[PDB]
């Protein structure tokens, strides 16, 4: 229920506003600017204000804060989806997310704003279906809105039927300081790239734990999705029923599904770091990493970031494999590989200097943080089964998916 | 600067016109107080081109509010645009209808209201039952006497799942006040 | 400076002129636009605000602005005096009652330093009933003869027929250009 | 070829369920 | 002779082929005409008398020729009887009392001596339902193993849904067409 979606900037200067339900003075903006910096001075900040009796509910964006005033108890929930599907559809309309877009795109973004929420209730936030009404560069609205499938534009045609698919698997493990991994989950992603001819009606089948239980398959690799989530295509009920993934696939690029089971395997990377920091005299990392996955697996661009000292100067690495960069923006020191074959180790031995005069106020100790990313390797085991797409006219797709390997919040403490 | 862009307003060139009319709204987000000229925008109003005429109506509900009496002279535009045949025109002077704030527009614009409540058009239905909100939202006295609770009970039962949704949405912020 | 291009356009038909619809209230104003423009009689609601045409006849662009003659809007006719050359009046013959509001409307709206170019134009609607009056009896009552420095013409023409249109367009036509 | 994996083609259903 | 004009419509398709809808009334035959032409589930009246329509697929022409299942026209598919190469039998898997008679009507049209090529396509209506039969229940009680000399396919397709309509039109065309 908000009152007024505008798009702040970084100093406090509002870049466009749009009232929808007019509640809300427009001067109410003014003191969110004051209100941020009280907040964050004395660590109260939140992404929902409160000035008085209305309260500012916003993100932050890359350069500007799209706060949406409210004064009604408004849903927070509808307000930050909203917010999101205005941050997605300005992404699609617009390659960056500035204060370079914000005045100079304000003809068709005004437009936009008026056409997306009208009296606070968001009625149309596809970007597909929302580019063919309101263009920068007007006919009727489309009949995708108006019809159930607002997710897919009828009369599309191409020259192929080729639909290219990526399972990106994020391998995230929360090692704590004592050695032992406390958080390891990995969360799935089905994105695929659509691009067929017509409206085909997409029919995923993998081979789920659940579906092979079924039909009496539960004895072979079946991936243990704890939680699924299927994307507006997927049918919620068909799901429900007997696990069919049936929905209309989309044009262009878009999230089906996206699983997320824990994982209870060892990581693929074991990182053995140890801190010989003298008392202001030097320091020592003895980082060894030992990849845990198959040999047949490459780890393409490793990156294990080992979190040296701030003040750290004059450092020397004695690595193995990969080349090691202190960058002191970061106050890190990137173990970068290019190439980590399975099963592979990699000793580092890192020295640093050190000031003798003790810093004023502690720093910390970040987590080290490893950027592995092994192509053509699923950690969870899920394989793709089958992909029935079904056409009206009839024609023979060819689909296409690869799966990535990657590394997602796999942090690991320091001591 | 005032008085060239009221002149470019006011001329018969439409390349002009469009001109003006950008540089207005601009002007209003960039932080310029340009309701001093909502008068003179309010002849360059009903155009054939869509580009002007949301610009147009966008700068109406932004300066409504600050000149009440001076939007007595968009009631008539609104009548005209509310039957164009392409539902996108229809569906912008409704969403324009319900956000103007003033007292002595919303009384007049029920009868708009009430032809839009059984629009064909799922986007025109949508709007009207957006409307229909608003304008219970501004005048709940206004909206009971106008007989929409029933329009809008009837649009959950109907078919246009989105205008269901929005039908069912007014009705709860109704119920809600 | 060259003067080709001028040349060139009027010599196929450059000039369009202007022209204004005032007069109360239900006089037929609309009507009269409705059918100067398409050729029917449509009815319309009663103007709350204006209705801005054109009427392209004798090479001529003649861009109607109607105004309506509601108490809300008969002090709202100065916003069209600006940029406007000429001006239509619509007398109401059949309301006897409301004959000297429409004088006196057009006697304040004549009385303006501003609109001093624009020709009058007196245009005799609701032809079609026994009780108007002829051509002359509603100008001696107006007193159109008593504007000095102002070119009136009376016409009559029916909203339900559509007779003197024709004859009105070309006396605007003649007043506004001095040319064969 | 492509980062991450060369992509693969995939089936039509589950032809040993039927 | 020549017929190098035969060998170049075939190089591009020239087959077309013909299809028969008969059945029981309310048997989803209308239904699975239109979702075949057309793709949507379409509702109408009940067929009083027939229905025509032509199916493109597969570079055949597959027209389909819907009869209804009325007591008045039940005898007039000898009609259709007369220039046909298919012939579709719409079961009615959802009505047990209806089973019967609708075996006995197929019986009684396949017990013509006129209709000996079109072969057997039977068609697994109505099923959405949890009474409706399987592929091979159905076909058991209608005893299709026992029709000697003909080449009956049973099908189960969703009114509602549209699922084996493909694999049905791939079977007519395999046994109908016996080339690559
Ligand atoms: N039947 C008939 N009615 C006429 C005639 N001339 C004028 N009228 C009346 O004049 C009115 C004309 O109204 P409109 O054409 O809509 O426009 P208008 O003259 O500006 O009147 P307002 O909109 O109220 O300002 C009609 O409602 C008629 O009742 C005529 O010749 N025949
Ligand atoms: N809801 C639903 N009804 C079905 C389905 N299959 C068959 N029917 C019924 O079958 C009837 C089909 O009638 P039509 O499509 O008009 O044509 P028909 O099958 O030849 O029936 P008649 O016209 O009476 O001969 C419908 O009225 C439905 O009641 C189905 O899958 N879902
Ligand atoms: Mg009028
Ligand atoms: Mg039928």
Not at chain 1, 54 to 82: D, E, G, P, Q
Not at chain 1, 105 to 134: A, C, H, R, W
Not at chain 2, 20 to 43: C, E, Q, R, W, Y
Not at chain 2, 100 to 129: F, G, N, Q, S, W
Request: proline share 4%; hydrophobic share 40%; net charge neutral.
């Amino acid at each position: 229920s908000a009152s007024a979606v505008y798009v702040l900037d970084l100093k406090g200067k509002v870049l466009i506003c749009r009232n929808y339900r007019g509640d809300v003075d427009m001067s109410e903006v003014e003191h969110f600017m004051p209100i941020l910096m009280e907040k964050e001075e004395e660590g109260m900040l939140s992404p929902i204000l409160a000035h008085g009796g209305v309260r500012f509910m916003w993100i932050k964006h890359n350069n500007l804060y799209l706060v949406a005033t409210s004064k009604k108890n408004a849903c927070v929930s509808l307000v930050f989806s909203f917010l999101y599907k205005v941050v997605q559809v300005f992404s699609e309309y617009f390659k960056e997310l500035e204060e370079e877009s914000i005045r100079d795109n304000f003809v068709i973004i005004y437009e936009l704003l008026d056409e997306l929420m009208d009296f606070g209730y968001p009625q149309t936030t596809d970007s597909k279906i929302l580019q063919e009404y309101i263009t920068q560069e007007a006919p009727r609205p489309p009949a995708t809105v108006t019809n159930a499938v607002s997710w897919r534009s009828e009369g599309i045609k191409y020259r192929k039927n080729e639909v290219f698919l990526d399972v990106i698997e994020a391998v995230n493990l929360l090692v704590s300081a004592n050695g032992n991994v406390l958080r390891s989950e990995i969360v799935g992603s089905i994105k695929m790239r659509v691009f067929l001819s017509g409206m085909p009606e997409l029919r995923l089948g993998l081979n789920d734990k659940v579906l092979f239980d079924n039909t009496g398959r539960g004895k072979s690799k079946s991936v243990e999705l704890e939680d699924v989530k299927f994307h507006q295509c997927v049918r919620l009920s068909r799901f429900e029923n007997d696990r069919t993934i049936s929905f209309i696939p989309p044009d262009g690029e878009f999230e089906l599904m996206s699983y997320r089971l824990n994982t209870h395997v060892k990581p693929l990377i074991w990182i053995e770091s140890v801190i010989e920091k003298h008392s202001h005299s030097r320091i020592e990392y003895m980082v060894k990493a030992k990849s845990q996955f198959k040999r047949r697996s490459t780890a393409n661009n490793v990156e294990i970031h080992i979190p040296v000292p701030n003040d750290a100067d004059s450092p020397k690495f004695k690595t193995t494999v990969g080349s090691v960069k202190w960058v002191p923006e970061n106050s890190e020191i990137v173990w970068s590989v290019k190439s980590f074959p399975g099963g592979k180790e990699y000793l580092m031995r890192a020295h640093f200097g050190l000031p003798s005069v003790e810093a004023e106020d502690k720093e910390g100790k970040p987590p080290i943080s490893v950027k592995f990313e092994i192509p053509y390797f699923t950690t969870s085991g899920i394989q793709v089964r089958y992909l029935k797409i079904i056409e009206k006219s009839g024609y023979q797709a060819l689909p296409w998916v690869r799966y990535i390997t990657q590394n997602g919040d796999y942090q690991l403490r320091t001591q | 600067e005032i008085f060239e862009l009221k002149a470019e307003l006011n001329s018969d060139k439409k390349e002009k016109k469009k001109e003006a009319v950008k540089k207005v709204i601009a002007s209003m987000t960039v932080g310029k107080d340009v309701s001093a000229l909502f008068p003179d925008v309010v002849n360059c109003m009903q155009t054939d081109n869509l580009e002007l005429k949301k610009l147009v109506y966008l700068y109406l509900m932004n300066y409504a509010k600050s000149q009440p009496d001076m939007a007595i002279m968009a009631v008539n535009t609104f009548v005209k645009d509310c039957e164009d045949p392409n539902p996108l025109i229809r569906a912008l002077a409704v969403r324009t209808m319900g956000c103007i704030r003033v007292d002595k527009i919303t009384e007049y614009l029920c009868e708009p209201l009430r032809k839009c409540l059984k629009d064909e058009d799922p986007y025109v239905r949508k709007t009207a039952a957006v409307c229909v909100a608003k304008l219970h939202d501004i005048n709940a006295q206004l909206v009971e006497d106008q007989g929409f609770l029933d329009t809008l009970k009837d649009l959950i039962s109907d078919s246009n799942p989105m205008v269901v949704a929005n039908a069912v949405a007014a009705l709860s912020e109704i119920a809600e006040s | 400076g060259n003067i080709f291009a001028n040349l060139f356009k009027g010599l196929f038909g450059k000039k369009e002129m202007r022209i204004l619809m005032v007069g109360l209230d239900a006089a037929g104003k609309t009507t009269i636009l409705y059918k100067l423009k398409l050729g029917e009689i449509v009815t319309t609601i009663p103007t709350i605000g204006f209705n801005v045409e054109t009427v392209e006849y004798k090479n001529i662009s003649f861009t109607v602005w109607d105004v309506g003659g509601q108490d809300k809007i008969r002090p709202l006719w100065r916003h069209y005096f600006q940029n406007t050359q000429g001006l239509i009046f619509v007398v109401d013959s059949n309301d006897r009652e409301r004959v000297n509001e429409a004088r006196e409307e057009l006697m304040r709206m004549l009385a303006e330093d501003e609109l001093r170019d624009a020709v009058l134009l007196v245009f005799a609607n609701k032809q079609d009933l026994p009780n108007a009056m002829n051509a002359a009896e509603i100008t001696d009552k107006l007193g159109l003869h008593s504007l000095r420095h102002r070119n009136w013409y009376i016409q009559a023409t029916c909203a339900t027929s559509g007779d003197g249109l024709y004859e009105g367009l070309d006396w605007l036509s003649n007043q506004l250009r001095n040319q064969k | 070829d492509r980062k991450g994996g060369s992509y693969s083609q995939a089936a039509g259903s589950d032809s040993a369920q039927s």
